[PDB]
Amino acid sequence: NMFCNKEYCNRLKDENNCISNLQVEDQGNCDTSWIFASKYHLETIRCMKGYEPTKISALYVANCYKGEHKDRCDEGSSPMEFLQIIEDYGFLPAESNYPYNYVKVGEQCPKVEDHWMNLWDNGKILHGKGYTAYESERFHDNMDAFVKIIKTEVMNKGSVIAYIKAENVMGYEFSGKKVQNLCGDDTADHAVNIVGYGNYVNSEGEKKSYWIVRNSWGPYWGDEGYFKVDMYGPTHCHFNFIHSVVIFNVDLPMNN
Numbered sequence: 001n002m003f004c005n006k007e008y009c010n011r012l013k014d015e016n017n018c019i020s021n022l023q024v025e026d027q028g029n030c031d032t033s034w035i036f037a038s039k040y041h042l043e044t045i046r047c048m049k050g051y052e053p054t055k056i057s058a059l060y061v062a063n064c065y066k067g068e069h070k071d072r073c074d075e076g077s078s079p080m081e082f083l084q085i086i087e088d089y090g091f092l093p094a095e096s097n098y099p100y101n102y103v104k105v106g107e108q109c110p111k112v113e114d115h116w117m118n119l120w121d122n123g124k125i126l127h128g129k130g131y132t133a134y135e136s137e138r139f140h141d142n143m144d145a146f147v148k149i150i151k152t153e154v155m156n157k158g159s160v161i162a163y164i165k166a167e168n169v170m171g172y173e174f175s176g177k178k179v180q181n182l183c184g185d186d187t188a189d190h191a192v193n194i195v196g197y198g199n200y201v202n203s204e205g206e207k208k209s210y211w212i213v214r215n216s217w218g219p220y221w222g223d224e225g226y227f228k229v230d231m232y233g234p235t236h237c238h239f240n241f242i243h244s245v246v247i248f249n250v251d252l253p254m255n256n
């Protein structure tokens, strides 16, 4: 029965889980997947510490940053910057306080109002970079260990951040109802989250396994905004579909 063990993890099937209540979002026509995937990883980390499934304001992160003005719609950033933004501001408003519209990416950072809730209240970034990252290509000859690392973090933190090449999921007949059997590229350009996994039997009757991946292209794309992808992919791939994974090292007290 249980919804997240070492062989099978799918919290989406449990309407009672905090994580299942974090609805899929749409980044729109800006390069802001770095914000969606990073804030979702924090949102699941919060769920695991007993907090409400309250959405972080992606627009606040897009619009509030130190230094010279940047083109926050045309230029993607990284999860390292999500953390840099937290550490500079110490405030993450709820989505409801400052809701996302992609055409507003670029607006002046809004003044925090008294009635805004702080979704990072009492949060600490652990020492020494604040995150841990892994490259699939560095595990080409111990893919098992890579899989194990990701499974453990999905179990414990509720998700990891993963980087993929967006083109790899733009196959002309991409169907969210199928486990995709995909290759990756030498590089990546789009942040997603791995949120679960399980085993399946493929079209050749072979035992295989899949990641469940959350995207930020709205709930119409894929399978209600998610898709399944084979952990290994075609034998011939030089590069795994999952290029990199990033995990945040955050200390949040058990509360709310």
Ligand SMILES: O=P([O-])(O)O
Binding pocket: 027, 030, 031, 032, 033, 034, 075, 076, 077, 166, 189, 190, 191
């Ligand atoms: O968020 P993206 O469009 O820079 O992959």
Ligand SMILES: O=P([O-])(O)O
Binding pocket: 183, 184, 185, 186, 236, 237, 238, 239, 240
């Ligand atoms: O498409 P490849 O570069 O993963 O073989």
Ligand SMILES: [K+]
Binding pocket: 183, 184, 185
């Ligand atoms: K490729």
